[PDB]
Design a protein around this ligand. Structure first.
Ligand code: R4D
Length: 332
């Protein structure tokens, strides 16, 4: 085609599904691992793993907009409002949890963790009485506040900011009875691929915010870590920008698939090249087409994560099993 990349078919109010699928698909290391997944004897209709192998294979080889129908059935979101009553990270968590589980006792075990799991500390400090309490807490994504925050940095600052527990919802320091305290969070690790959700949907039903929130092509996060490391500093490259319109809502995803800063818009079946300004700055908001989710890759990890993927990477049992189904489909 015009781009070398191909689109996905619209077959429902799947909303963010197509944006999310092309984002996962262009996370080449994830792709490679999905292809190695022992889906030999899987029921061809109820296996989320295989279904996703299908879509990836398809987006890699076909000239023709790919379809999602078997996948939507796969994981059982089939009602009118099933995608309207969840967010992206819930879908994402459904797809990755499936695939991480399938990948147990295999060559590719532990890929999803390695790609997207970071580590946070959650601490509670009482002011007067001396008592403190830390504990680790894994995350595969971050939800960042927007309202009243001008740019990413301000959202991070707000995330790791300390909060008080006075009067009404004091802290049970246990032996020490109710106590005034501060609780906060801090990062121990940031993963290779960093899924950040922007908090534009709030509740008399939920409404979409649309104010200006800015983010950069390059994101220094070292400041937000509990202890840094001058060998691998926490600098992220922007990889995808997932976007929505209105309240009436269109859903597109911008990508720079190779991390080289050459951008494409993915509007279902239409995939054109575009400027960095349409991808980035045009998605800030202001006074209502704008970004709800961002994917950043650590610069140290760019190459491994975006490693090149040929057709040799798909294995044989899969290729021929995928081949057959098209043929049975051809019988019509
Ligand atoms: C249906 C809705 C359309 C939409 C609403 C708000 C902003 C943009 C487009 C849609 O398709 N959504 C997909 C995107 C979200 O997932 C983002 N999101 C995630 N996590 C949160 C956690 C807490 C609070 C708020 C959010 C949030 O807005 C919202 C739902």
């Amino acid at each position: 085609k015009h781009t070398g990349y191909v689109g996905l078919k619209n077959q429902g109010a799947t909303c963010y599904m197509n944006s999310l699928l092309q984002t996962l698909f262009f996370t080449n290391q994830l792709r490679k691992a999905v292809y190695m997944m022992p889906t030999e004897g899987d029921d061809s209709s109820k296996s989320v793993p295989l279904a996703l192998q299908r879509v990836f294979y398809e987006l890699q080889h076909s000239d023709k907009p790919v379809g999602t129908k078997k996948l939507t059935k796969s994981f059982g979101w089939e009602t009118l409002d099933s995608f309207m009553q969840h967010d992206v990270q819930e879908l994402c968590r459904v797809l990755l949890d499936n695939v991480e589980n399938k990948m147990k006792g295999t060559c590719v075990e532990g890929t999803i963790p390695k790609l997207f799991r970071g580590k946070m500390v959650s601490y509670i400090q009482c002011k007067e009485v001396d008592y403190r309490s830390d504990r680790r807490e894994d995350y595969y994504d971050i939800q960042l506040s927007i309202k009243g925050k001008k740019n990413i940095f301000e959202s991070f600052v707000d995330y790791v900011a300390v909060e008080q527990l006075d009067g009404d919802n004091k802290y049970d320091a246990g032996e020490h009875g109710l106590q005034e305290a501060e609780k906060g969070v801090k990062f121990l690790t940031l993963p290779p691929v960093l899924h950040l959700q922007l908090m534009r949907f709030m509740y008399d039903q939920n409404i979409k915010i649309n104010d200006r929130f800015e983010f950069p092509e390059q994101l220094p996060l070292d400041e937000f870590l509990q202890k840094t490391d001058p060998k691998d500093p926490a600098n992220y490259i922007l990889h995808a920008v997932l976007v929505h319109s209105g309240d009436g809502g269109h859903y597109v995803v911008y990508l720079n698939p190779k991390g080289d800063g050459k951008w494409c818009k993915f509007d279902d079946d239409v995939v054109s090249r575009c400027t960095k300004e349409e991808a980035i700055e045009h998605n800030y908001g202001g006074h209502c087409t704008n970004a709800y989710m961002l994917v950043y890759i650590r610069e140290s990890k760019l190459s491994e994560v975006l490693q090149a993927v040929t057709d040799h990477d798909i294995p044989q049992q899969l290729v021929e099993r995928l081949q057959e189904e098209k043929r049975i489909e051809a019988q019509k």
